[PDB]
Amino acid sequence: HMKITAARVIITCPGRNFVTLKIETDQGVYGIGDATLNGRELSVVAYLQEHVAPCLIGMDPRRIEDIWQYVYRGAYWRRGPVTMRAIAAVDMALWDIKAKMAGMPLYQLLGGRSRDGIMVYGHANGSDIAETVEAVGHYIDMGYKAIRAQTGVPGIKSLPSVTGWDTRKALNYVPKLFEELRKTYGFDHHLLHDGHHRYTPQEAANLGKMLEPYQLFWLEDCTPAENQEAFRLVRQHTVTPLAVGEIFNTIWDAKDLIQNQLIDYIRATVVGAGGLTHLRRIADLASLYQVRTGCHGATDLSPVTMGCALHFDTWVPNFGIQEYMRHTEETDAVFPHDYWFEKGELFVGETPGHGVDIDEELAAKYPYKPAYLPVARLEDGTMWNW
Amino acid sequence: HMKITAARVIITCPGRNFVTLKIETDQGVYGIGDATLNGRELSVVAYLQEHVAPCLIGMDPRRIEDIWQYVYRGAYWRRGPVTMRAIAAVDMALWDIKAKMAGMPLYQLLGGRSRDGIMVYGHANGSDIAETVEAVGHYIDMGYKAIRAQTGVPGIKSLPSVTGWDTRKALNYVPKLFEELRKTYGFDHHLLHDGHHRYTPQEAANLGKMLEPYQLFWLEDCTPAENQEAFRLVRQHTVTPLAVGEIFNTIWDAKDLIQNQLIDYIRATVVGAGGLTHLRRIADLASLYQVRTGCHGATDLSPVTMGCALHFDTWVPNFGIQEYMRHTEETDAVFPHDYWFEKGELFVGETPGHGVDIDEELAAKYPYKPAYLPVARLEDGTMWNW
Amino acid sequence: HMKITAARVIITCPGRNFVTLKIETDQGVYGIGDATLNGRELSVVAYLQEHVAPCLIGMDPRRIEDIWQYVYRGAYWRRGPVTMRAIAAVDMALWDIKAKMAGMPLYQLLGGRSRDGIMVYGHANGSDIAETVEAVGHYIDMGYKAIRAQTGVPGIKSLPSVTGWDTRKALNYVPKLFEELRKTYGFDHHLLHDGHHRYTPQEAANLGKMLEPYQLFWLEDCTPAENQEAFRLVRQHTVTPLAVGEIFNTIWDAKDLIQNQLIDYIRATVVGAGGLTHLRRIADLASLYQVRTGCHGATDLSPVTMGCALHFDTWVPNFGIQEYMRHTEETDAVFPHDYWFEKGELFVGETPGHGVDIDEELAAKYPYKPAYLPVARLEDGTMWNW
Amino acid sequence: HMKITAARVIITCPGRNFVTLKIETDQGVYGIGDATLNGRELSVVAYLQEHVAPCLIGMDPRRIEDIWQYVYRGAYWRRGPVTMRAIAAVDMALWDIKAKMAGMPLYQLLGGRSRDGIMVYGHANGSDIAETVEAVGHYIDMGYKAIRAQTGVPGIKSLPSVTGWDTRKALNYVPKLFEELRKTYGFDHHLLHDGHHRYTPQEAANLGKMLEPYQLFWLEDCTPAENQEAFRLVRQHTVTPLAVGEIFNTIWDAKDLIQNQLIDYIRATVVGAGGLTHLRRIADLASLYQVRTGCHGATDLSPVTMGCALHFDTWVPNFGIQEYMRHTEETDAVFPHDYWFEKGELFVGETPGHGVDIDEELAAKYPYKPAYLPVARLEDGTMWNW
Numbered sequence A, B, C, D: 001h002m003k004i005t006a007a008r009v010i011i012t013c014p015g016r017n018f019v020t021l022k023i024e025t026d027q028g029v030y031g032i033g034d035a036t037l038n039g040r041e042l043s044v045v046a047y048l049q050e051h052v053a054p055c056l057i058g059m060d061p062r063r064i065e066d067i068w069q070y071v072y073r074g075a076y077w078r079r080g081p082v083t084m085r086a087i088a089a090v091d092m093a094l095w096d097i098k099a100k101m102a103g104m105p106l107y108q109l110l111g112g113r114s115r116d117g118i119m120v121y122g123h124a125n126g127s128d129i130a131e132t133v134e135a136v137g138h139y140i141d142m143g144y145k146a147i148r149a150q151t152g153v154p155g156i157k158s159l160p161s162v163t164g165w166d167t168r169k170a171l172n173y174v175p176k177l178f179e180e181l182r183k184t185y186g187f188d189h190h191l192l193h194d195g196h197h198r199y200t201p202q203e204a205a206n207l208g209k210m211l212e213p214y215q216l217f218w219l220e221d222c223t224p225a226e227n228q229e230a231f232r233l234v235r236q237h238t239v240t241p242l243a244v245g246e247i248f249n250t251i252w253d254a255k256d257l258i259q260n261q262l263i264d265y266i267r268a269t270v271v272g273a274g275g276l277t278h279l280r281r282i283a284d285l286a287s288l289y290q291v292r293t294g295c296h297g298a299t300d301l302s303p304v305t306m307g308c309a310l311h312f313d314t315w316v317p318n319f320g321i322q323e324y325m326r327h328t329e330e331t332d333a334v335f336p337h338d339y340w341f342e343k344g345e346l347f348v349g350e351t352p353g354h355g356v357d358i359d360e361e362l363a364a365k366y367p368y369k370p371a372y373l374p375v376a377r378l379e380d381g382t383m384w385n386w
């Protein structure tokens, strides 16, 4: 059989850090996968380079499922952010190889096209309501159909930045943002809000109810969800739609949230949750309960992830929306890709594979630089959820 | 305030790989913690050295809870084998410092002594029933009160070794081991069996029922438990006691298994599940339902973990048993410790701290060497659970 | 081992009755604990002096957990207000000794500091809405961040005083208090209300809904809770936050209220619910469901309890709020302590122990005087819940 | 109205300690009630003498329900062993007065006679199986229809005595006792066993199954029951009948055990659980699920309790059995009573009241002497349940 000859980790920082796995074969064809774990990147580098990659040498890269099961089960210690990023990188690279060998863009292998373009949302941010309202208008004018709106709250504020938070101040202020947005722009546009893990379940229920008159597309990550019962009170009390899951890494993180009908959108991603192989299983479970996909799409997911995400989004029947933050020009140059943006939609191209590659010579000119996600504390100093 | 000046990772292989974190302070006192993750060790090295440790510099090491919450919440991507090993290492080192500063052995700070010695079990292994029966006898003769018995099954068989498995062959053979053990040795000794994740829930129910006449201390890890509902059928159908959790890393992995009364012993460890700080919370939840601790204790948990485990075991009210595999002489020399074994019990000493230290000069003479856990496949080649 | 030489009960009335246990040792170090049970004080005196204390003589006071289990299990008749006050007094005294021996303030032994100051609420009372609104303003002006507001209701009224109650009159009046408070002071301040056990579950649901526009911090003790299902209808029908538990004495009183997510704040105290040892277990169970601590803090909890409560509050991750009623000057003199109040927050000091002591010579100058809590009856004479 | 003039506490030790309340009135009629709480007796003395009794002076003793509610609700701190003993003593004394005033034995006021004699069980104890089998035979020969059988286990062992325990040793031995009893005496006699709180739920399930061939009348107190879910696994796994509740003090301790059909007999008593008034409510809830009464009846319940218990047992429709341990001759002389034993049954007499009185002059000749219940520890020293 054809064999894996190398599984190499490539690190680059063209505006921010990205980690990529390149699986090479004895036939010539290669595939690439994203391994980026924002703020903990080098843990995945080691997991791959020192442990997983040596096991892959000599394996048959056509055996996507077997290799997935080998790395998942064979680890012994199962699941987790680092573990699943490594598995995702392998899986993306193997699907890239499979699609190249089939002479087809990846969405064709998944079951073909279900839709034309992929609806996105962008990020309208402001320091206060007035600034945020202005920002949403600029996104509307750019042709976005859906916009996430986030405001700073008056009275709230190389190593992690420490930010402040106060729930009462936010509960008193956030609903007024959405009131003003609907007064200014009407109800035609999809409006989204990220609760950023800040609220208890009762508080999220309160906030959800206060947001009902404004017909939100979703309220996201309203309360920490390691306990999958945490969404129960929220769902009982509000008809504001709920989303969660960018930080999830396996179906086991979401099975009860889905089966108990506690969420409307699942936000797990190709890189976060174990590749195309595993994300398909999450989306299928979701579909049984009419839960839709809402893949996370911040810049810390490389263009390799975005290419795979768009192939996935183009096929998956229960697609909801795709988050889109634009990468830097330098990032786009390091990772040439066959997808594009037009009038509020992303489109994947027909290049065999997932359509993304990496320019290794150029990537080597942007050295790794440590960078951390911020943390949050309450006014009294209590460590909180950022 | 006193400050952390360094948080250094030390790697050594005195018979097998161990990773240790040493937290140093500007007062002079230091603490150490185990970070060893068998078969994925260097992923934790990177998680600590490249990401967590730089954040700890300048922090007040007296703030154990705050630092735990900072590393747990501040990671953004929560839980997981690598993540929680890093957190455990920090937590052990900080409790070591706290106990040293208090001038007390660690168990005193946890609430003091609940018992004298710590009951252990050892591993009696054989290639067939006859060999396994002989091995159990040797453990009995050595004064062990509790013995795990594992047999090879006739017809079943630097990089991971690939082993074979067949469930029907095992279901036909394993119960006969326990029949023979009770015929030979009677019912005085505690007898344990590790199902090694091999069975479905229905199969584990079947096996559990077949083992009932032999009054086992536990049947462990009978079926994979990422789905916490997996133990439901087993518990419904058998009164053989059930244990699980060496591979768990947070309370979120076990909350339903405990609250639904699906297990008798929780096997999570100080190193696996986030240190003394977090393991206490797991044990307390367990206690509400009369579930007892049965900490895993294989050699891939360093003597630093064993010292912390024994301090924990000496205090915790709902102690059940402690697994004990003896380390090599070289490992014992690299990690001098104040605990000892006598007549089937471990005992922790009175040295302030957790009682363990690391000889860095000696540790440097045993270089890291890659080593992997085995994997298992069914007879047709299907990737399985080892 | 070091031994308990005496466990002495001290009674004093420096403005109101307090009972204190002092555990003395053969090394010299001693510890003190609160045993005060308002309106039934001498039952605890007897429980301790005639029964528990003689068993403690000769025990090793370092064995906090063992002694807790001995007094809890060994009583045979388990739980209860008198029983648990006795256990709490012992536990506080033993933690006081442990912290003194460690040379650390108590919060350090619990896991260290999670926050700086401790947010409190005070009691704004009035005979009608106008008077109550004035009182809340005075608390705001004094720098309180949180205020409990209680009003008399027009038409409602050495041995226990008999008070009157009528639910319909209150349901028609209480919501107007919170309407007026928000009209007058806005939404910046945390506003609390104690329902004083007066309502049925349906009535509490009704009241909770009527209070929703006013964004309360909590509605407390809305309905009697011996039946832990009593909060179910309330939680189903309102997003007003719920608190309960000042009269609870073990985790068994609260486990279902917590696990079924029926409350936002648990109000159990160090003295009410079995000391630091047991209150930690309650707080930890609460944390799994994002339930926060809201310890009761009326004057019938002595400064010994307040010191322990503040050490607990300084460490506990899921802190919510601390009730604060100021003791008399005479009480403060009898129980010198290292905690203080500034701008709406309490702060614990660094004195080893819980930081509180008792001046026995001064305490002896204020003799015990019987005093009872009031009772309540409905308009027709029916015995009710005060 | 007629008034309570005194409510006096009388203490005596005619072989063991008893506490009695005597309520006197301005008409002349008086009533007495048991307040005995074994091993904590003087806590109830204080609760009554220093707190409750002064509130009763001047009340109308005909108002049994109102006084019950006053002492129960008015305490503020609700339920508990000490609290409920005090309430029980009052309630018994008031029912005694009511029956005297009606000119009827107490059972007539409860609803009249449902049966003739009251089936009892006695205690056959032995140090080993042979001795226990002999003891059961002596009870059979004395005409007992029902016998509790308790054996010591080989290998198991003024201040509380410390006893030993080991679960595995007992699980290996106890079933053989019942095997031998059925071999020797056949199946005609009711055979009972008290598990003495020693087992976990899984262990109790195991034991229950092992006892099935021997057709026990009940297995009692198999596992601690503060968590009312503790009986769930036991009930799921065995058809051996289950009993619990001698240590319960309110219906709130038993409501879920009853409604979830986890027990066959409720063992709460007139003295333990708040008098005739409250025990009636427990028995009625039990009856809905065909659960029967099995009142505890050890010697630490005075003849005042036994008289009330027998009046209750004579009326209650869902009577199951009454425990009977004979008091000393001296105890019988101090508490003259109208009940008697014949051929395995107790009978209550027709004396108006509950039929019991106290000879105060004689009682004064037997002074109080401290005496404690034993405690139990596991072999390693762990504090356990006696």
Ligand SMILES: [Mg+2]
Binding pocket: A194, A220, A221, A246
């Ligand atoms: Mg987000």
Ligand SMILES: [Mg+2]
Binding pocket: B194, B220, B221, B246
């Ligand atoms: Mg194992």
Ligand SMILES: [Mg+2]
Binding pocket: C194, C220, C221, C246
């Ligand atoms: Mg209150």
Ligand SMILES: [Mg+2]
Binding pocket: D194, D220, D221, D246
């Ligand atoms: Mg009993």
